[PDB]
Amino acid sequence: LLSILRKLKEVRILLLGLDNAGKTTLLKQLASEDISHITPTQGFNIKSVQSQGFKLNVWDIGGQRKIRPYWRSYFENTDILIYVIDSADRKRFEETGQELTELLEEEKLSCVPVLIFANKQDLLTAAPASEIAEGLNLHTIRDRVWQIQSCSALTGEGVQDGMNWVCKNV
Amino acid sequence: LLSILRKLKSAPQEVRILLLGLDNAGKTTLLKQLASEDISHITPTQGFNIKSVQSQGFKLNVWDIGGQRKIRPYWRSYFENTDILIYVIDSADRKRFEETGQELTELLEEEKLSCVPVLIFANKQDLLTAAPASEIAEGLNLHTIRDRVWQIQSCSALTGEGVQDGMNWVCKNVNAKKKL
Amino acid sequence: AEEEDEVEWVVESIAGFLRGPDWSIPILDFVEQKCEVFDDEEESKLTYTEIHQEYKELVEKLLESYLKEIGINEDQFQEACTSPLAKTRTSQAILQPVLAAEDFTIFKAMMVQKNIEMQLQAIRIIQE
Amino acid sequence: DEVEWVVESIAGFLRGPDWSIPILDFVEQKCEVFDDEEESKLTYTEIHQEYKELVEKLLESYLKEIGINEDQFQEACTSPLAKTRTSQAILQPVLAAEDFTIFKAMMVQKNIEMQLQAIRIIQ
Ligand SMILES: Nc1nc2c(ncn2[C@@H]2O[C@H](COP(=O)(O)OP(=O)(O)NP(=O)(O)O)[C@@H](O)[C@H]2O)c(=O)[nH]1
Ligand SMILES: Nc1nc2c(ncn2[C@@H]2O[C@H](COP(=O)(O)OP(=O)(O)NP(=O)(O)O)[C@@H](O)[C@H]2O)c(=O)[nH]1
Ligand SMILES: [Mg+2]
Ligand SMILES: [Mg+2]
């Protein structure tokens, strides 16, 4: 049995959101690496970050539409969900809301805590932290602890803010 | 050039410890204790063992070389880039105190080990016949040591008693060689 | 203390299996046949995950066949894998393809390294 | 920034055959004595010293052929770009020159593989 094998050897974090949301950018921030050479993710990135006495294994899966049917393949053994939204791209709020809804009804993601990053706040096109919350109907969620954190992956603002929530809920 | 290559390491955090002393002193038993590993099938070491232990901010790489006379001419192959010397004595084996003192003296005179901090473990203190660390230090004239820091620590590798006390001293002196 | 001793035997039996040809050659075949797609880059392709699923199935199959033939139940197998002896009676080299079943990071590294090696041999051969 | 080019130059070398083939030939020739056991043999250390001399000769030739002086090399190896532009797989035989533990694992693993292949062939 495969699960028995893991005792021969720890937090798995699933990072999802639409294409261009800033997921990879955030991940390289978390990993303290150079940002300048980030391209659209055609598959997925993993990086492990040491914080809070935890090993954070963060899976950044590409958000283009053609990749979204593969999301299901990364649901198993998820401990935290981090969902990223481009807060300046209002015309995609419906699309990202529907992905988030499908994620929150997913069996394999039954009771996983979810953090929502209202990204790209550096830009003042960005909608307030939670003009976005609802429109997304986040106060209606009921079998799960959640949070929304205004942030900015470019420069770093509020990322640590959200990351602290992510792991009081481990 | 080869020393430049260590900068390619993840956190070049790493401490190289050389563990020496006569055959039967308890070196391998000590090593396995440090690594929290089973000691039940330890045999005389014909070559050497290496164990990496995470302790108080450092990755300690401990090199356990066999202490039989036939192996001691190879000890010097392990001197270069030593950050710390741990020298182990069977405190109960008084008949071999002269032999082990002569090995320590040669080590402390060795050019490739100059300025290296040395911890002397007075091992097997679980045995009633064990001589006190005080008596061993006096016998080895340890006070006369110059040009390096040193420490002697009573321990039993078999029980684990005193081992962490010795290793706490080691971790405070990870840079004594370089600062000197 | 006796089924403690029996668990030590199970640890040894597993180690023997993981060194043997019934485990090692199918693992070797799989790695050599499926690594060509594994590029030495930080970003992973979706196809890596699908190949990992295939690897997981092979690993489960090999282990079930072993447990059945030798006659070791899963509870016992669990006890042996949890034992600290499992890590010290089996080398890191021997354990790697086992840990790769649950750990994709180890799996990718294994596959990427083999691809590098096979591409190198293909290049040297190209003209002697 | 000239350091970035040096980093990529080095990575290109480590991916190339000028480096990789002599390294592969040493490992394949010498690994048979590396048993997969915890305790190491005194002979492993002599073989590691031979490996060091090979790696040093290879790097020294490359640097002089291309026109990179030792301090440029040190600057590049010290840059964080070194770790991001070169993978752990490509770095492994490099780090093995300094780190015996990495060296032994490399030899033990190749020895296991060569034996497995020998078995498969007669099977
Ligand atoms: N203004 C601003 N731009 C950002 C921010 N985060 C990312 N970007 C920019 O938006 C683009 C997309 O970032 P990226 O991290 O690639 O997004 P992604 O979610 O990983 N995309 P995909 O899922 O397709 O791979 C890049 O040009 C990036 O620099 C942010 O907080 N603010
Ligand atoms: N009572 C007692 N016995 C000990 C202690 N440490 C080691 N021994 C015993 O002394 C013997 C020698 O142990 P060992 O670890 O092999 O010594 P060594 O220094 O590695 N020998 P060599 O250098 O030949 O390999 C073993 O029987 C071991 O169990 C200790 O603290 N107390
Ligand atoms: Mg991306
Ligand atoms: Mg020994």
Author numbering:
A (entry chain B): 3 to 11, 17 to 177
B (entry chain A): 3 to 14, 16 to 183
C (entry chain D): 3 to 130
D (entry chain C): 7 to 129
Which of the paper's sentences describe this entry?
The ciliary protein Arl3 has been shown to act as a specific release factor for myristoylated and farnesylated ciliary cargo molecules by binding to the effectors Unc119 and PDE6δ. Here we describe a newly identified Arl3 binding partner, CCDC104/CFAP36. Biochemical and structural analyses reveal that the protein contains a BART-like domain and is called BARTL1. It recognizes an LLxILxxL motif at the N-terminal amphipathic helix of Arl3, which is crucial for the interaction with the BART-like domain but also for the ciliary localization of Arl3 itself.
